[PDB]
Amino acid sequence: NLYNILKEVTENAGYKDPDRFWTNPDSPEAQQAKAIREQKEAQPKPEDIKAQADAQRAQSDALAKQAEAQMKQVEAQIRLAEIEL
Amino acid sequence: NLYNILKEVTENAGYKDPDRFWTNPDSPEAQQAKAIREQKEAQPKPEDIKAQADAQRAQSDALAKQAEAQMKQVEAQIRLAEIEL
């Protein structure tokens, strides 16, 4: 639609050929340019920092769960064995 | 397209030769200038800090997993032997 508007303005100005001043968005060069433009939004700045923060959150979950279970098992067997003797 | 517009304006102003005031974007010098301009977009600043944080907390996850496994092996092996004796 914008390309059509620009064509109409240019033709009314007095230039019959509109490709001299504008680029058709359906031309293969325009499609390629749109391809690179779309490819340039792979990932923003702090989102991968966000992902590695999620990784450290997961490791915190792990360490906490294993610490709790390990200390429970510590109470299970390191005391009663020396209690009975 | 911008080069064509500038050339048209210059010719209408009364100067037949447009290369005196503008340079053709298809000229080899323009291609070289575009080459250095693109090359100066190799890596922005914060992204390496991002990758550094990635590595640091992948480090955190690693040491978390090894710590959990090591403590599990300690509790399963350093205790029963001294319990039985």
mmCIF file of C-alpha atoms in Angstrom:
data_model
loop_
_atom_site.group_PDB
_atom_site.id
_atom_site.type_symbol
_atom_site.label_atom_id
_atom_site.label_comp_id
_atom_site.label_asym_id
_atom_site.label_seq_id
_atom_site.Cartn_x
_atom_site.Cartn_y
_atom_site.Cartn_z
ATOM 1 C CA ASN A 1 0.000 0.000 0.000
ATOM 2 C CA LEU A 2 2.803 2.434 0.842
ATOM 3 C CA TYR A 3 4.540 1.509 -2.407
ATOM 4 C CA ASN A 4 1.333 2.223 -4.335
ATOM 5 C CA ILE A 5 0.967 5.596 -2.605
ATOM 6 C CA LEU A 6 4.560 6.490 -3.470
ATOM 7 C CA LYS A 7 4.005 5.416 -7.081
ATOM 8 C CA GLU A 8 0.920 7.610 -7.331
ATOM 9 C CA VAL A 9 2.726 10.622 -5.863
ATOM 10 C CA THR A 10 5.727 10.171 -8.159
ATOM 11 C CA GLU A 11 3.571 9.730 -11.265
ATOM 12 C CA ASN A 12 1.545 12.827 -10.403
ATOM 13 C CA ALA A 13 4.839 14.687 -9.970
ATOM 14 C CA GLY A 14 5.680 13.942 -13.600
ATOM 15 C CA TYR A 15 7.924 10.867 -13.559
ATOM 16 C CA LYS A 16 6.407 7.902 -15.380
ATOM 17 C CA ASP A 17 9.039 5.407 -14.214
ATOM 18 C CA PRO A 18 8.725 4.912 -10.429
ATOM 19 C CA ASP A 19 11.538 2.369 -9.993
ATOM 20 C CA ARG A 20 14.118 5.155 -10.307
ATOM 21 C CA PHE A 21 13.129 6.587 -6.914
ATOM 22 C CA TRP A 22 11.521 3.649 -5.079
ATOM 23 C CA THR A 23 12.024 -0.082 -4.598
ATOM 24 C CA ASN A 24 9.226 -2.594 -5.055
ATOM 25 C CA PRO A 25 8.774 -4.521 -1.773
ATOM 26 C CA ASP A 26 7.935 -7.656 -3.790
ATOM 27 C CA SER A 27 11.231 -7.576 -5.693
ATOM 28 C CA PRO A 28 13.705 -10.337 -4.744
ATOM 29 C CA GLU A 29 16.178 -7.791 -3.363
ATOM 30 C CA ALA A 30 13.483 -6.508 -1.006
ATOM 31 C CA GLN A 31 12.684 -10.068 0.076
ATOM 32 C CA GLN A 32 16.369 -10.680 0.791
ATOM 33 C CA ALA A 33 16.649 -7.445 2.775
ATOM 34 C CA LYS A 34 13.596 -8.441 4.808
ATOM 35 C CA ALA A 35 15.208 -11.847 5.353
ATOM 36 C CA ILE A 36 18.350 -10.361 6.907
ATOM 37 C CA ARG A 37 16.268 -7.835 8.858
ATOM 38 C CA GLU A 38 14.156 -10.625 10.364
ATOM 39 C CA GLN A 39 17.262 -12.720 11.039
ATOM 40 C CA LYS A 40 18.768 -9.839 13.020
ATOM 41 C CA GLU A 41 16.289 -10.426 15.926
ATOM 42 C CA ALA A 42 17.683 -13.801 17.000
ATOM 43 C CA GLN A 43 18.083 -12.768 20.650
ATOM 44 C CA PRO A 44 18.211 -9.501 22.634
ATOM 45 C CA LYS A 45 20.876 -8.415 25.105
ATOM 46 C CA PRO A 46 19.753 -9.596 28.585
ATOM 47 C CA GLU A 47 17.626 -12.614 27.588
ATOM 48 C CA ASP A 48 20.594 -14.976 27.434
ATOM 49 C CA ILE A 49 21.701 -13.554 30.781
ATOM 50 C CA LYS A 50 18.156 -14.492 31.775
ATOM 51 C CA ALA A 51 18.661 -18.057 30.539
ATOM 52 C CA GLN A 52 21.932 -18.487 32.440
ATOM 53 C CA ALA A 53 20.203 -17.071 35.515
ATOM 54 C CA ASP A 54 17.581 -19.783 35.025
ATOM 55 C CA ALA A 55 20.420 -22.307 34.920
ATOM 56 C CA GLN A 56 21.796 -21.046 38.235
ATOM 57 C CA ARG A 57 18.285 -21.166 39.695
ATOM 58 C CA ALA A 58 18.092 -24.821 38.664
ATOM 59 C CA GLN A 59 21.452 -25.563 40.283
ATOM 60 C CA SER A 60 20.248 -23.834 43.455
ATOM 61 C CA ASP A 61 17.174 -26.091 43.452
ATOM 62 C CA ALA A 62 19.422 -29.126 43.042
ATOM 63 C CA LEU A 63 21.955 -28.204 45.736
ATOM 64 C CA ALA A 64 19.142 -27.404 48.171
ATOM 65 C CA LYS A 65 17.302 -30.697 47.603
ATOM 66 C CA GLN A 66 20.453 -32.809 47.881
ATOM 67 C CA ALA A 67 21.527 -30.857 50.974
ATOM 68 C CA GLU A 68 18.192 -31.521 52.692
ATOM 69 C CA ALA A 69 18.171 -35.223 51.809
ATOM 70 C CA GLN A 70 21.842 -35.612 52.743
ATOM 71 C CA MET A 71 21.383 -34.005 56.157
ATOM 72 C CA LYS A 72 18.297 -36.140 56.816
ATOM 73 C CA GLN A 73 20.312 -39.260 55.993
ATOM 74 C CA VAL A 74 23.071 -37.894 58.238
ATOM 75 C CA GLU A 75 20.626 -37.806 61.135
ATOM 76 C CA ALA A 76 19.492 -41.286 60.088
ATOM 77 C CA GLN A 77 22.727 -43.190 60.676
ATOM 78 C CA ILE A 78 25.638 -41.113 62.062
ATOM 79 C CA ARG A 79 24.031 -40.782 65.517
ATOM 80 C CA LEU A 80 22.076 -43.942 66.378
ATOM 81 C CA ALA A 81 25.134 -46.057 65.548
ATOM 82 C CA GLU A 82 27.208 -44.179 68.128
ATOM 83 C CA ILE A 83 24.193 -43.919 70.453
ATOM 84 C CA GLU A 84 23.918 -47.696 70.801
ATOM 85 C CA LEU A 85 27.668 -47.941 71.468
ATOM 86 C CA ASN B 1 17.293 5.606 -5.360
ATOM 87 C CA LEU B 2 18.754 8.303 -3.106
ATOM 88 C CA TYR B 3 21.666 8.703 -5.513
ATOM 89 C CA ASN B 4 19.227 9.125 -8.405
ATOM 90 C CA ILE B 5 17.266 11.753 -6.471
ATOM 91 C CA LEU B 6 20.438 13.679 -5.634
ATOM 92 C CA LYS B 7 21.628 13.463 -9.243
ATOM 93 C CA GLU B 8 18.287 14.776 -10.500
ATOM 94 C CA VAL B 9 18.369 17.680 -8.041
ATOM 95 C CA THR B 10 21.945 18.562 -8.995
ATOM 96 C CA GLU B 11 21.223 18.423 -12.730
ATOM 97 C CA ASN B 12 18.131 20.592 -12.293
ATOM 98 C CA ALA B 13 20.248 23.072 -10.324
ATOM 99 C CA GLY B 14 22.423 23.538 -13.405
ATOM 100 C CA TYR B 15 25.410 21.241 -12.869
ATOM 101 C CA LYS B 16 25.649 18.588 -15.574
ATOM 102 C CA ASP B 17 28.361 16.499 -13.889
ATOM 103 C CA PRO B 18 26.994 14.971 -10.652
ATOM 104 C CA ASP B 19 30.177 13.162 -9.570
ATOM 105 C CA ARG B 20 31.675 16.460 -8.391
ATOM 106 C CA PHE B 21 29.189 16.721 -5.508
ATOM 107 C CA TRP B 22 28.178 13.081 -4.936
ATOM 108 C CA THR B 23 29.699 9.617 -5.165
ATOM 109 C CA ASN B 24 28.062 6.619 -6.794
ATOM 110 C CA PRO B 25 27.150 3.946 -4.210
ATOM 111 C CA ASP B 26 28.073 1.290 -6.795
ATOM 112 C CA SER B 27 31.600 2.656 -7.229
ATOM 113 C CA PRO B 28 34.368 0.419 -5.820
ATOM 114 C CA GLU B 29 35.276 3.038 -3.212
ATOM 115 C CA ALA B 30 31.689 2.967 -1.945
ATOM 116 C CA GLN B 31 31.777 -0.835 -1.792
ATOM 117 C CA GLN B 32 35.006 -0.669 0.209
ATOM 118 C CA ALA B 33 33.529 1.906 2.589
ATOM 119 C CA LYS B 34 30.500 -0.335 3.098
ATOM 120 C CA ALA B 35 32.881 -3.235 3.740
ATOM 121 C CA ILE B 36 34.672 -1.438 6.579
ATOM 122 C CA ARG B 37 31.347 -0.129 7.905
ATOM 123 C CA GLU B 38 29.952 -3.666 8.124
ATOM 124 C CA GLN B 39 33.216 -4.996 9.570
ATOM 125 C CA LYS B 40 33.011 -2.415 12.367
ATOM 126 C CA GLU B 41 29.816 -4.226 13.457
ATOM 127 C CA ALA B 42 31.669 -7.366 14.543
ATOM 128 C CA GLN B 43 30.727 -7.490 18.225
ATOM 129 C CA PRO B 44 28.889 -5.033 20.498
ATOM 130 C CA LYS B 45 29.974 -4.408 24.063
ATOM 131 C CA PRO B 46 27.549 -6.080 26.539
ATOM 132 C CA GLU B 47 27.207 -9.357 24.608
ATOM 133 C CA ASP B 48 30.581 -10.683 25.729
ATOM 134 C CA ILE B 49 29.591 -9.839 29.307
ATOM 135 C CA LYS B 50 26.448 -11.867 28.584
ATOM 136 C CA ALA B 51 28.498 -14.845 27.387
ATOM 137 C CA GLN B 52 30.756 -14.425 30.421
ATOM 138 C CA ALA B 53 27.752 -14.670 32.749
ATOM 139 C CA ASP B 54 26.623 -17.709 30.753
ATOM 140 C CA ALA B 55 29.969 -19.404 31.350
ATOM 141 C CA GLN B 56 30.110 -18.365 35.012
ATOM 142 C CA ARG B 57 26.759 -19.835 35.926
ATOM 143 C CA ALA B 58 27.229 -22.931 33.782
ATOM 144 C CA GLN B 59 30.294 -23.224 36.025
ATOM 145 C CA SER B 60 27.920 -22.823 38.972
ATOM 146 C CA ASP B 61 25.650 -25.618 37.702
ATOM 147 C CA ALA B 62 28.636 -27.891 37.092
ATOM 148 C CA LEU B 63 30.113 -27.478 40.567
ATOM 149 C CA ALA B 64 26.595 -27.931 41.952
ATOM 150 C CA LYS B 65 26.223 -31.327 40.274
ATOM 151 C CA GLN B 66 29.694 -32.507 41.285
ATOM 152 C CA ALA B 67 29.141 -31.297 44.859
ATOM 153 C CA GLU B 68 25.852 -33.204 45.088
ATOM 154 C CA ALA B 69 27.361 -36.414 43.710
ATOM 155 C CA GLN B 70 30.449 -36.068 45.914
ATOM 156 C CA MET B 71 28.427 -35.539 49.092
ATOM 157 C CA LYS B 72 26.155 -38.472 48.227
ATOM 158 C CA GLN B 73 29.192 -40.712 47.734
ATOM 159 C CA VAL B 74 30.695 -39.449 51.000
ATOM 160 C CA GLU B 75 27.564 -40.231 53.003
ATOM 161 C CA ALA B 76 27.111 -43.617 51.324
ATOM 162 C CA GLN B 77 30.743 -44.699 51.840
ATOM 163 C CA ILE B 78 32.545 -42.862 54.689
ATOM 164 C CA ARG B 79 29.876 -43.717 57.279
ATOM 165 C CA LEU B 80 28.799 -47.364 56.985
ATOM 166 C CA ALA B 81 32.421 -48.519 57.226
ATOM 167 C CA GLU B 82 32.923 -46.747 60.556
ATOM 168 C CA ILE B 83 29.423 -47.773 61.672
ATOM 169 C CA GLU B 84 30.176 -51.483 61.295
ATOM 170 C CA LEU B 85 33.460 -51.109 63.204
#
